[model samples]
Target: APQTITELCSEYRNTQIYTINDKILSYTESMAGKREMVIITFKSGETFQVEVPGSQHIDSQKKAIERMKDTLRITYLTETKIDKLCVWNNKTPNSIAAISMKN
Candidate 1:
């Protein structure tokens, strides 16, 4: 069975999760870095933005994004470049763009 939020959190307390001000759950990261925020608009027309830690573990982070996609039932539209970093959501691939920094 897929892990519940409580279960996942309990098991990975030391790990950091992408959250929307501690409200909405998004992604999980095992590294320390800036947080990337994404907005989710549900079918009910409710929208939420979540902040997730930037990670070096691309594959794992990508998986976490996928899980978020499945859970949120929304698509990423576009990513806006902020300085050297880029913020993306439901564009073509609905996947996170490549992040250069890893820590």
Candidate 2:
């Protein structure tokens, strides 16, 4: 009978904040097609995706850990930019609004 008290999960406390295990901890879909991505979500539960990737490191990106600061650099292009780059979008699939909403 071996009953050892070992920690099951380290990150299982139900907490928050898009940082702390935010940067460099992703398999960020290696974009070989030369196209970066950016998505947007409105209060109406609708999402908008937009991206324009170029192979232009341009002597920039100094690895600032949690998101080096690329989104801000291009924010001048779009005023509504939120500086969020994710490899995976969990709830991106349409058609599945639970809770309430009917005709």
Candidate 3:
């Protein structure tokens, strides 16, 4: 016996807005209380941390400014100070490598 077209649609398609809302809410909740930090390492392989402000959520206005700035395209974990090795970009938990200071 062949399945009806409506039965197939009912099984596959999303019919609820709550599903979308839940996804976004979950992301927001996960990102809360997490702060972005700027990290620096020395020649001796020692590291230090500094914090960045208000970088947890996606903001259209901030992204627009960042796009215009070119350099701000990345979410930097640390800014450079003095002559230490600065790590600016953040990667997933599995892959993190220390970056050297450019300036």
Candidate 4:
């Protein structure tokens, strides 16, 4: 079943939302020593790596996503369900990709 905006918002109130022009394949984070990083992999074998502040991985991730969205001229919406997130071009009231709070 297609997820609704109301359902998405309620479920992911604490989640951070992001949008990209490319399909994300996977993501990983590392906190080895004083180095913190969030690495995102795209379906086309492209990778994006961002260095985040120590002990603030999630906040850094959010900032990095926002920066990327702005740099790439993409639309991003915060507060939405993970399953309901997608790329909606030229459409208002559309779904957005989410990063879980527990991440």
Per-candidate Cα RMSD to the true structure, in Å, reads: 14.2, 16.9, 20.5, 12.6
lDDT of 4 by residue, 1-103 (tens): 3255434545533433333344346655566876455555545454444434435347656666556444322222232223323322222222133432211
Off by over 4 Å in 4: 1-20, 54-103
Could you tell me every candidate's TM-score relative to the true structure? Answer: 0.28, 0.20, 0.21, 0.32
Query: For each predicted model, how many residue pairs clash, with residues at least 3 apart or on different chains?
Result: 8, 1, 3, 0
Higher-scoring candidate on lDDT, 1 or 4: 4
Q: Which one wins on TM-score?
A: 4
Pairs clashing in candidate 3?
37-77, 38-77, 38-78
As a whole number from 0 to 100, the lDDT of residue 33 in candidate 4 is 75
Better of 1 and 4 by TM-score: 4
Runs with alpha carbons beyond 4 Å of true place in candidate 1: 1-4, 14-37, 40-54, 74-103
What digit string (tens of lDDT, one per residue) describes model 1 on residues 1-103? 4244434434432332223221222323333445344554323343443345345446667566646544433322222111111223433212333222122
lDDT of 1 at 51: 43
Compared with the true structure, what per-residue lDDT tens digits does model 3 show for residues 34-63?
Answer: 654334333443433333334543575444
Question: How many steric overlaps does candidate 3 have?
Answer: 3
Clashing pairs in 1: 75-90, 76-89, 76-90, 76-91, 77-89, 77-90, 77-91, 79-88
- For lDDT, the strongest prediction is 4
